Amino acid sequence: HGYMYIPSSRTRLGHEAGIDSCPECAILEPVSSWPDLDAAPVGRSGPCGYNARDSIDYNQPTTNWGSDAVQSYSPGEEIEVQWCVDHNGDHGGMFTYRICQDQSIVDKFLDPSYLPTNDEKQAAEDCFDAGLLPCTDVSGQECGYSADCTEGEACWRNDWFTCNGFEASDRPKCQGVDNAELNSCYTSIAGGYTVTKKVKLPEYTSNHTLISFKWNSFQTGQIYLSCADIAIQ
């Protein structure tokens, strides 16, 4: 259980607006999340997430999210990106951030009067996959391989970030990455822990585009997706 925290995602805003009772619950399942991290169709979840608890589809704006950029950046800027993991749902695994560099695709996710179809959500997901922001694009960032992967498998890739080993004696799992205090970020179930990295934004301008967060489990078949509205100017 988790969701994107910085920049503030649609899911974070849905919870802060008093709409989403369990932001960390928005999940794509059942799916094959491992070891091939991008083969599973994203279905209704799409690149922004769907929360079944309250029937909230984050792929379209409402009065509470999606209307404008939450934060503005510069092309090529190295930025802080953070997600929030629940204390009781820390799965380990691998996660990433993506930006679709096709504005006309993204526009269909910026219209409060339009709900993307599942085919449009998948075409968008494919554009996000193409627009993955690699861990390794940030000078000096350590980009390791997963303790839950072996070379030759489709999870053996350090463009994606990895959580710490599930079985590590010190600082295991995703919480171990920052080793932050409980409730350093909000979750509804048991309180949240931050998971913080940097990415290099693309050399691309938009007054309003999306960054999509994706987190895949290894032990169970589950994917968590969120997106944030940003500007790159």
Ligand SMILES: OC[C@H]1O[C@H](OC[C@H]2O[C@H](O[C@H]3[C@H](O)[C@@H](O)[C@@H](O[C@H]4[C@H](O)[C@@H](O)[C@@H](O)O[C@@H]4CO)O[C@@H]3CO)[C@H](O)[C@@H](O)[C@@H]2O)[C@H](O)[C@@H](O)[C@@H]1O
């Ligand atoms: O308004 C929110 C919040 O802002 C500040 O705190 C931010 C953040 O601080 C801490 O996260 C740390 C990580 O723990 C630490 O590991 C490090 O992550 C680095 C890595 O070291 C690098 O290798 C590379 O990948 O980049 C990441 C990200 O820079 O630094 C981050 C902070 O950037 C803390 O654990 C989190 O809980 C915090 O959100 C203010 O201090 C805070 O008061 C305020 O609440």
Ligand SMILES: *[C@@H]1O[C@H](CO)[C@@H](O)[C@H](O)[C@H]1NC(C)=O
């Ligand atoms: C953003 O909008 C302003 C109009 O307010 C315009 O001048 C500028 O070119 C736009 N930027 C992009 C990246 O489209």
Ligand SMILES: [Zn+2]
């Ligand atoms: Zn979970």
Ligand SMILES: [Zn+2]
């Ligand atoms: Zn479940």
Ligand SMILES: [Zn+2]
């Ligand atoms: Zn694949």
Ligand SMILES: [Zn+2]
């Ligand atoms: Zn286009």
